[PDB]
Amino acid sequence: SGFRKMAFPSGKVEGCMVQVTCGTTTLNGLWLDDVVYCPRHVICTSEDMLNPNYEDLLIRKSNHNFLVQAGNVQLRVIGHSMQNCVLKLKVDTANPKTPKYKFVRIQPGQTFSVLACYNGSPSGVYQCAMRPNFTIKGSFLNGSCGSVGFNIDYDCVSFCYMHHMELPTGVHAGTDLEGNFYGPFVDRQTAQAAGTDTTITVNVLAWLYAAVINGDRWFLNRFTTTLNDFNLVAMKYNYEPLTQDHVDILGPLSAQTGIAVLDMCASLKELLQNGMNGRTILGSALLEDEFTPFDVVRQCSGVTF
Amino acid sequence: SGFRKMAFPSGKVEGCMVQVTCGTTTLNGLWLDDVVYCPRHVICTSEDMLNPNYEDLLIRKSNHNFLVQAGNVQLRVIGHSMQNCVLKLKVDTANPKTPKYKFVRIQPGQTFSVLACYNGSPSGVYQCAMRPNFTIKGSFLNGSCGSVGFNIDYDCVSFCYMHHMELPTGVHAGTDLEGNFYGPFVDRQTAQAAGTDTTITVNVLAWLYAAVINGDRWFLNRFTTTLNDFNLVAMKYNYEPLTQDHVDILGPLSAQTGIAVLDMCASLKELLQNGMNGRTILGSALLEDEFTPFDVVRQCS
Ligand SMILES: O=C(NCc1ccc2c(c1)CCO2)c1ccccc1
Ligand code: NA
């Protein structure tokens, strides 16, 4: 029994984390095969950051301008190039700890584990969701740029996120491992802001199913609804619209608990319209939306990695 | 910025997880140097789970009754011994992945990471706290026995918990790595129940200090309180008593924010009285008690 926000075991990724220094800026890099990946803004001075030309800033740097430390051992950079917003440093040694891996770009609402890192030394691991507004509610301090986010599907690590910056509201923005930003952000010090966020509806429903499996059932009721009716209510409370593909995805959980999705939507509608009436669900007083359906299935069936 | 329930990176513990089998029972073991540690109730049988005599069950076992599998490899057991409620299997291979480590028994309110495992392979990592009633509010399925809880301050892994059982309320109970149970529980299936649980007051205060550090002040007030008056109010909300030790511990967070510890106790009293009135603190609509003063300092600026 029990239900916790749970990250993937991070050991496969810890073995890929290295320290990258260019001048007075130290941050984190990801070392896979013979390439170190890191944010391209590592090459900027604070004055470059206002309006950088990254192609030009890079040509002046030689290979020995990039100091890479894997633990307490130095790596030799033999080449350097840029892909979108990530810098790729070719090194003379393949990482013998390179796990089986892929680079994947995730969709808003999907979750992943972040390995927070400083000076190439992993310091913490936590679960995040890619928000509908393409930010993530992370926990980062200066020196954390280049920390990465990932899932483990079977034995393959799927890398999906690399941290670049913090927005004024304290949420965080970054890229996939091919350097494309999530959301309408750029890697430069100008005025940027998170858009108004919304709640991930399919994830809230998944978490209600998890609550039921753990014996938390007070919110269930006799009613059911329709997609049209519910989606009107969802729009009213700044929830993402529920689609037929979401209902199919929650299909397994509906069969296991005997609560149809629109049966549970009637529960969620009543909670949105009336509150929780002093009660909690899985120890939360607010509706939790950073557990996907797959997360609930995996934690409630024990799929080890 | 940001504040998350953060666990420790689990790699150093992943490299120590093995599978222990005895009879039809399989659970997890912890492989440090040439010893594998696992819950002694792996040697129990079906009809003998209310009142096992572990000394009698153990003396009938030979080393080859224990099947220990590290990854795809079979480890050879060359000795065994029981220490309180943990079984210590001597093996013929020292674990090449053994980190710098120690064993530490923790007190209620302390936090640690749990590496949940099944059949010797890690499933996930999450953060926990030892409740005042000596249980932990974990996420464990059948076969998770032998999963461990730990901290990794500096480069040294401090092992503080090994999972043994689930109580009827769905909370979990276990031992330190010396095999001594946390709280009044025993490794028997006799009727056992956890004491009424209470909120860890010093931790809530730490977390309120965290909210201020990250820029939120809405819950402060112009008031203060004596320590005894605070405890008289807080006990009525099932909160743990706050001690002078706790006040001393919050000293640093107090100095960093400018808010005296007893001034923050006054803010907590008001929050208990008023609720949140639709607002949230660090993302929660409830008061959070699984961040220690030490946690807040490591995570915040
Ligand atoms: O903790 C559970 N089993 C482990 C266990 C605990 C005590 C004990 C033995 C085994 C043998 C000797 O005494 C559990 C409890 C509720 C539901 C499912 C599992
Ligand atoms: Na219903």
From Swiss-Prot, chain A:
Active site residues of this protein: H41, C145
Highest taxon of source: Viruses
Catalytic activity of the protein: TSAVLQ-|-SGFRK-NH2 and SGVTFQ-|-GKFKK the two peptides corresponding to the two self-cleavage sites of the SARS 3C-like proteinase are the two most reactive peptide substrates. The enzyme exhibits a strong preference for substrates containing Gln at P1 position and Leu at P2 position
UniProt organism field: Severe acute respiratory syndrome coronavirus 2
Effect of M49A: Does not affect ability to cleave and inactivate human TRMT1
Cross-link (Glycyl lysine isopeptide (Lys-Gly) (interchain with G-Cter in ubiquitin)): K5, K90
Protein name: 3C-like proteinase nsp5
Location of the protein in the cell: Host cytoplasm; Host Golgi apparatus; Host nucleus
Chain ranges of the Peptidase C30 domain: 1-305
Protein function: Cleaves the C-terminus of replicase polyprotein at 11 sites. Recognizes substrates containing the core sequence [ILMVF]-Q-|-[SGACN]. Cleaves and inactivates human TRMT1, preventing tRNA guanine(26)-dimethylation of tRNAs. May cleave human NLRP1 in lung epithelial cells, thereby activating the NLRP1 inflammasome pathway. May cleave human GSDMD, triggering alternative GSDME-mediated epithelial cell death upon activation of the NLRP1 inflammasome, which may enhance the release interleukins 1B, 6, 16 and 18. Also able to bind an ADP-ribose-1''-phosphate (ADRP).
Cytoplasmic face residues: 1-305
Quaternary organization: 3CL-PRO exists as monomer and homodimer. Only the homodimer shows catalytic activity. Interacts with host FBXO22; this interaction promotes the proteasomal degradation of nsp5.
Activity regulation text: Inhibited by pyridone-containing alpha-ketoamides compounds 13a and 13b. In turn, alpha-ketoamide 13b (tert-butyl (1-((S)-1-(((S)-4-(benzylamino)-3,4-dioxo-1-((S)-2-oxopyrrolidin-3-yl)butan-2-yl)amino)-3-cyclopropyl-1-oxopropan-2-yl)-2-oxo-1,2-dihydropyridin-3-yl)carbamate) inhibits SARS-CoV-2 replication in human lung cells. Inhibited ex vivo by michael acceptor inhibitor N3. Inhibited ex vivo by compound 11a and 11b.
Lineage: Viruses, Riboviria, Orthornavirae, Pisuviricota, Pisoniviricetes
